[PDB]
Ligand binder design. Sequence first.
Ligand SMILES: C=CCN(Cc1ccccc1C(=O)NCC1CCCCC1)Cc1ccc2c(c1C(=O)O)OC[C@H](CCC(=O)O)O2
Ligand SMILES: C=CCN(Cc1ccccc1C(=O)NCC1CCCCC1)Cc1ccc2c(c1C(=O)O)OC[C@H](CCC(=O)O)O2
Ligand SMILES: [Cl-]
Ligand SMILES: [Cl-]
Lengths: 149, 149
Amino acid sequence: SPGIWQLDCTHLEGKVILVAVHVASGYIEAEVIPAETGQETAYFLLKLAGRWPVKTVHTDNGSNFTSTTVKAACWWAGIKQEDGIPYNPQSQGVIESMNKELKKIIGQVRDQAEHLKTAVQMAVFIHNHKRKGYSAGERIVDIIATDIQ
Amino acid sequence: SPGIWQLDCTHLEGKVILVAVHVASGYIEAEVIPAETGQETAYFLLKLAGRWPVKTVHTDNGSNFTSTTVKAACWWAGIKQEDGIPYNPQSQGVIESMNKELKKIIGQVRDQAEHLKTAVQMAVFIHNHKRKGYSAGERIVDIIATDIQ
Ligand SMILES: C=CCN(Cc1ccccc1C(=O)NCC1CCCCC1)Cc1ccc2c(c1C(=O)O)OC[C@H](CCC(=O)O)O2
Ligand SMILES: C=CCN(Cc1ccccc1C(=O)NCC1CCCCC1)Cc1ccc2c(c1C(=O)O)OC[C@H](CCC(=O)O)O2
Ligand SMILES: [Cl-]
Ligand SMILES: [Cl-]
């Protein structure tokens, strides 16, 4: 589970916010894209996997699961591409809660930037630093460091 | 030590590659931008600081040191903005070597993508995973986890 991530796509201001969640910690990376295509998703995974040791990704929908470009990125980066079926029903709830929380934070910062992408990065920062007492940023590093050792 | 990063700007294909190096580990993040501006640099630092506990940034040149947009990003993200003067001359050489290494890797992957940005992210992945033994990705996590504990 140190290497397990979940993709999540949410919408705001007629744009798409693509999110990757490190399941065990709740740490996130996110980007704003015009629409959720295989190429956009592939490029996002490529970025993520260069930055964190991504072993497995649960894709956010069937189109990204099927996409040969997404499969190509997962092959390139050594990621096991999996479905995102919530066999554990609590999974849906957690993601939905996170999207609601992220949108709330974006609202709280929205006037501190012209562009949504800037607001989204502020929200990523606030989310990852929030103490809940460790932060998600602390938890991910601790989990991965323990795995290396 | 755990919180110190250095900015670095290099050029390829008439574009600019902006790099942040975690000094203690050699771990990097990078992006392709059309030109180095204060806004581009500010946005890059905002992304970086949401993802890693960035305490101090040594800026890459005087224009980014001076930039009020860069200063605003550093204020927002709680980063101490510093100059990048190589008081230790070995610092110049290290960054020079890294740029040469990155450009080499980009050449090795260049035909595996149409767009330079894709090649640069492949290069980030290869750089961070390269065992020299531990990888830079392993070193950064271990350094930061040790700090937290
Ligand atoms: C003079 C800068 C323009 N903005 C002024 C602004 C406009 C409206 C409200 C507040 C502020 C404001 O000063 N906020 C304080 C502070 C500055 C930003 C970091 C922390 C918050 C801010 C900004 C900076 C970099 C960006 C932005 C944006 C944006 O407004 O969204 O948008 C995406 C762009 C992408 C990279 C590229 O394309 O160069 O990088
Ligand atoms: C059908 C995809 C188009 N490319 C085909 C290609 C073209 C030439 C050579 C090899 C390949 C090839 O299949 N390489 C294998 C493989 C592809 C997945 C990544 C690992 C390597 C690849 C690609 C994917 C996403 C991107 C790209 C690019 C690009 O070619 O650079 O460019 C930036 C763009 C930004 C996000 C956005 O704008 O959607 O995301
Ligand atoms: Cl963090
Ligand atoms: Cl890594």
